[PDB]
Design a protein around this ligand. Structure first.
Ligand SMILES: [Ca+2]
Ligand SMILES: [Ca+2]
Ligand SMILES: [Ca+2]
Ligand SMILES: [Zn+2]
Ligand SMILES: [Zn+2]
Ligand SMILES: [Zn+2]
Ligand SMILES: [Zn+2]
Lengths: 478, 478
DNA sequence: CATGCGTCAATTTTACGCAGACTATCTTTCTAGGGTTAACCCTAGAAAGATAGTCTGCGTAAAATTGACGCATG
DNA sequence: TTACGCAGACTATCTTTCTAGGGTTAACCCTAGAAAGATAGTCTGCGTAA
C-alpha cells in the first residue's frame, strides 16, 4: 500500500479542502456555538454596536484566515495597533476591524461552561477535550505512513497559570505545555499525539516513555514498521515487548549510559581507539557502542536483521549512519512550525492550543496536497503559495458579505472589491441575438443637413448614432 | 556635573539631527568612497542600466532608512522576494527596488582594499576600524554619565568564516562575534565598547576581565562613580586597583566561586540557616555570603562604604538589593535590540558590525531626544514614533530624486507623491502641476506589451481607455 | 425635413522603432535554527548571481477609420 | 434646487494588568510593551428645505 493519502483523500487539488480535512464541520460548529455564550455573558447594556454581535460560521472561518496570513508574514508578535494600520498594509483591515478582532479573541470557547464545573472532575484538559479528540482523529484516519516512524516531544510555549505548565531548561522557551507526538519519517506527517497533563495522567506500573510509545503506536500496531527513539523512549523491555502477537514494531534508538543492561565491555573508553565500535547482543536485540572523540561514547540499541556492518566511507557503524537519518522527523516538523507560526500572546492556555492545532493542520494539509498534485505529473507549489491561497479561500466569503453594509468606509470598500476574486457576470462571451442595423444609416441626433454616417449602435438601446453625439453608449442609456 | 546630553548637542528637538549626531558625515563619506570601489569591479560590460550605478551620499542615507523601518516592524527575516511585493506593502518599493537593494547590500565596503593587505597582520579587524573608532568617539562626547555604570557583553550571532567569532554554549545565536560595552544605568546609554578579537589583543599578565574594565573606564575617570558587574569582571585586585590615584571607580559585583581571596568563613557550612547572611572585611572591601531559599550560597563583593544592614521588606542585605537593581544596565540594551532591530543573514562578516552599529545609534539617539524634550516641559513620544520619524526624515531627499525620471513607473510615482511631507510653498491640491499625467500614454485594459496608446478616458470611473475597447465609458462602467 | 448609395481626402488608431528604469523566477551555494552523542549533525529556505520579461515615455509611417461633399427619388 | 441633521459601522488613544524575553545566584528576578478594557471620537449614506 506504500504510503500516501488514503482513499478518501485522493484527487483533492484544492488546498482549502486539504485544510478542512483537519477542521471538520463538527469542530467549526462547536466553536461558534460555545463562543456565543461568552459574547452574550460579557455584553453590557452600553455595548450595543456592531462590534459586539454574535459569531457566524463565516466569521469564524475568516478569523482563521487572518491567523494563517500572520504566520506567513512572520508578524505574529506585532501588536494589533500596527497590524490594522492602513498606512502600512490593507491585508488585515479588508477582512476584519481591529476592535472586533480583539473582541473575538477574548471570547472564543470550546466547551459548555455550565457543565464544565463537574465535567472536569478527573480531567484537567476538559475545556478543550472535545475539539482535540475530533482533530486528532482526522490525522490518524487520512494517511498511510511508510516504513519509518519516529517519536519525540514538542513544546507549546505558555505562561499564565496553566495547570499543566512545565519548566523545561535547554529549550527556546522555558515554560509551556508539553505534547508527545508520532510522525511519519521523511515526509513529516503527524500521525498521532497526546498532551502531557501530569496530574491527569495515569500509567499504572508503566514509565512514561514506554506508555507513550505504546499508545502513540496504536494505528500501526502489528504492521511491522520501525520506530526511531531518543533516550526518553528507549527502555529495553519496550524494544522486546513490541515484538509480540499484539504490537509488531521495532525500536531503533539511543540508550542512556547509566542503564545496567549495557555490558561493562562496551563502556571501556580507555581501551577503545577513536572511530571504533563494539557489538554484542541479547536475544533478538543488537547493541552497539561507538567511540567518537575521546571521553565520549554512543550507545545505540536496535531490533534488526542480524548482520552488522560499518560504512567504510565514514568509519561509523551502520546503526549510527541509519539513526541520524530518521531521528529528525518530529524535530523537522517543529522547525517548520517555528518558521511559520500563528501563536499570539494570550491570557488563557486553551487559546494557546488552538494556535498549535492551526500550525499542524497547515502542514499536514500541504503533504496531502503535494502527493495528489505530483502524482498526476503536475508541479507542486511551495508552502508560501499554499498559504497565500488559504488566506483567500478562508476569507473571501466573509469579505464579500461585508460589502452589504451601506456604511462601509471607502477604504475598505475599494480594497475588498479589488482583492476579492473579480468574477465578472457576462464573461461567458456568448450574447443573445437581437435585431441590429445591417444597412447604411444616419445619426438620429444629427440634423438632415449633416447626414452623418452612423458608426455606432447604443450599448443599451440599439439607437443609430454618431460618435460625436452618442459615443458608444447613448446619453439616455448612460 | 549633572546627567544628560552635553552642551554641544543640547538644543536638538528632532530625530534626524539626533541620529546624524552619532554617525556624522565622516562615516558616510568613507563608506561611499569605498563602496564605489566594488561597484566598479563587479560591473561587467554586459551589466548596464540604473541598477548598476555608483553610490551617492543621498542613496546611502535612503539605504539606512530602509534598514530602520525594517527594524520598527518585526519583519527583518523576510526574503527580499516579498518585502518588495507591492500587493502586501508600499513601504519599501517606494524607496528603491528589490534588485538594487540586493546589489548594494553585497557591495558596501568600509576600507581601501589596496592598503589593507599590509595592515591586516596586526589589525585583524581592519575592514571596520575607520568606521568603528569614529562611532565610539562620537558616543563618548555627546552624553554625561551618572553615578551608576554597568559593564557586560553582547553577541551579534553571525556564523561563517571570520576570526572574531567564538562559540559560547548555553546562548542563543551561540556562534557570533563578541562585543564588550559599558552603559549608564537608568537611561541605558552606551558610553564605550570594543570587540573581542580572540588573539592579538595584547593583554599582558592581566586577565581580560580586569583589562577591559580598565580600558572601558577611561572616558569616565573624573569624579568618582560606582561600576557594577558579573563574575567575568570582578577579580579582587581590580577592586583594589580602581582605588589607586589614576583611577576613579568603586566596584560592586558578584564573585566567582573557588577564588583564593574569599575566606572559608563565607564558603562555609551546611549548618547556616536559610535566609541569613554573613560579612567579612578587608580594609576598604566588604564581602558577603548570602543563603537564599534553595540553600546554596551567592558571593558578592563591594569596595564601597555602604552599610551592611538588611532591607526589611525582603530580608536581603541592602548590598544584594543594590546589585539586583543595577546589573540590568547592559542587558536591557539587548532587550531593546531584540524587539526593534536590523539584522540580515549574510555571507560577509563586516556587515554584522554595520547592523549592530545602526541598532545602537537608534537607541542612543532616542535617549538624547527624550531628555531634551522633557526638560522643556513638553511630551515625549514613544520609541516607535521616533523610529517612524527617522524613516520619514531620512529617506525623503532621495525619494524626491526618483521623481525626476520621465519613466519612473507610475504606480510608484503616485505613492511617492502622497507619502511625502510638502516642502513646497504656494501650492494646493487644486493648484498643481500634477494633471499633466492625466494623459497616460496606454490603455488600462490592453496588454502593455503592445504599446497601444490611449486617447480617451471612462467618464464614470475616470480611467484611461482605448477606442478598441470603448470610447466614452469603459466596459465596466454602465 | 427625412433615408439608400459613391468619391476620396483628412483625422484618428494601430504597429511597432528607439530608450529607460524596474520585476518575476531559476539553479547553485551555504547560513539560521535548534537538538543533542555533539567545539558535531541535519533540514529548510534565504542570499548570490544571472537571464529574459514588464511597464512607462516619446516618434514616425502606414493602415483602417471617419466625414464632408456628389446625389436620388419622396 | 443648492447644502444640513440622524444612525450605522469603524478608529485613535488613554490607563490599568501581567506575559514574552533573556540572564543568571535564579524551580527566581527585572524590564519593555502587548493585551484587556473603556471612553471618547471619525466618516459614510439616507431624509428635509427656498
Ligand atoms: Ca486593542
Ligand atoms: Ca534577490
Ligand atoms: Ca553578563
Ligand atoms: Zn450625429
Ligand atoms: Zn441608447
Ligand atoms: Zn484597450
Ligand atoms: Zn470606467
Amino acid at each position: 500500500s506504500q504510503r500516501g493519502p488514503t482513499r478518501m483523500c485522493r484527487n483533492i487539488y484544492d488546498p482549502l479542502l486539504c485544510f478542512k480535512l483537519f477542521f471538520t464541520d463538527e469542530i467549526i460548529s462547536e466553536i461558534v456555538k460555545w463562543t456565543n455564550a461568552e459574547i452574550s455573558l460579557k455584553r453590557r447594556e452600553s455595548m450595543t454596536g456592531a462590534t459586539f454581535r454574535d459569531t457566524n460560521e463565516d466569521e469564524i472561518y475568516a478569523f482563521f484566515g487572518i491567523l494563517v496570513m500572520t504566520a506567513v508574514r512572520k508578524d505574529n508578535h506585532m501588536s494589533t495597533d500596527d497590524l490594522f494600520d492602513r498606512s502600512l498594509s490593507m491585508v488585515y483591515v479588508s477582512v476584519m476591524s481591529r476592535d472586533r478582532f480583539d473582541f473575538l479573541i477574548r471570547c472564543l470557547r470550546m466547551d459548555d461552561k455550565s457543565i464544565r464545573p463537574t465535567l472536569r472532575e478527573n480531567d484537567v484538559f476538559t475545556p478543550v477535550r472535545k475539539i482535540w479528540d475530533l482533530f486528532i482523529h482526522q490525522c490518524i484516519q487520512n494517511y498511510t505512513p511508510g516504513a519509518h516512524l519516529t517519536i519525540d516531544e514538542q513544546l507549546l510555549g505558555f505562561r499564565g497559570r496553566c495547570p499543566f505548565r512545565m519548566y523545561i531548561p535547554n529549550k527556546p522557551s522555558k515554560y509551556g505545555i508539553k505534547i508527545l507526538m508520532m510522525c511519519d519519517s521523511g515526509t513529516k506527517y503527524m500521525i498521532n499525539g497526546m498532551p502531557y497533563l501530569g496530574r491527569g495522567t495515569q500509567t499504572n506500573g508503566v514509565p512514561l516513555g514506554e506508555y507513550y510509545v505504546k499508545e502513540l503506536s496504536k494505528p500501526v500496531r502489528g504492521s511491522c514498521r520501525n520506530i526511531t527513539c531518543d533516550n526518553w523512549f528507549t527502555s529495553i523491555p519496550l524494544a522486546k515487548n513490541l515484538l509480540q502477537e499484539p504490537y509488531k514494531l521495532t525500536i531503533v534508538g539511543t540508550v542512556r549510559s547509566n542503564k545496567r543492561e549495557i555490558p561493562e565491555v562496551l563502556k571501556n573508553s580507555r581501551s577503545r581507539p577513536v572511530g571504533t565500535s563494539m557489538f554484542c547482543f541479547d536475544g533478538p536485540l543488537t547493541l552497539v557502542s561507538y567511540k567518537p572523540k575521546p571521553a565520549k561514547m554512543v550507545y545505540l540499541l536496535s531490533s534488526c536483521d542480524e548482520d552488522a556492518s560499518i560504512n567504510e566511507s565514514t568509519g561509523k557503524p551502520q546503526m549510527v549512519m541509519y539513526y541520524n537519518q530518521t531521528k529528525g522527523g518530529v524535530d523537522t516538523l517543529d522547525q517548520m512550525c517555528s518558521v511559520m507560526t500563528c501563536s499570539r500572546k494570550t491570557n488563557r492556555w486553551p487559546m494557546a492550543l488552538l494556535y498549535g492545532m492551526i500550525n499542524i493542520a497547515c502542514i499536514n494539509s500541504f503533504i496531502i496536497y503535494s502527493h495528489n498534485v505530483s502524482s498526476k505529473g503536475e508541479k507542486v507549489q511551495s508552502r508560501k503559495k499554499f498559504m497565500r491561497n488559504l488566506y483567500m479561500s478562508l476569507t473571501s466569503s466573509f469579505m464579500r458579505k461585508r460589502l452589504e453594509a451601506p456604511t462601509l468606509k471607502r477604504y475598505l470598500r475599494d480594497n475588498i472589491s479589488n482583492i476579492l476574486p473579480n468574477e465578472v457576470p457576462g464573461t461567458s462571451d456568448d450574447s443573445t441575438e437581437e435585431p441590429v442595423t445591417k444597412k447604411r444609416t444616419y445619426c438620429t441626433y444629427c440634423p438632415s443637413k449633416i447626414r452623418r454616417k452612423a458608426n455606432a449602435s447604443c450599448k443599451k438601446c440599439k439607437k443609430v448614432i454618431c460618435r460625436e453625439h452618442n459615443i458608444d453608449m447613448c446619453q439616455s442609456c448612460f
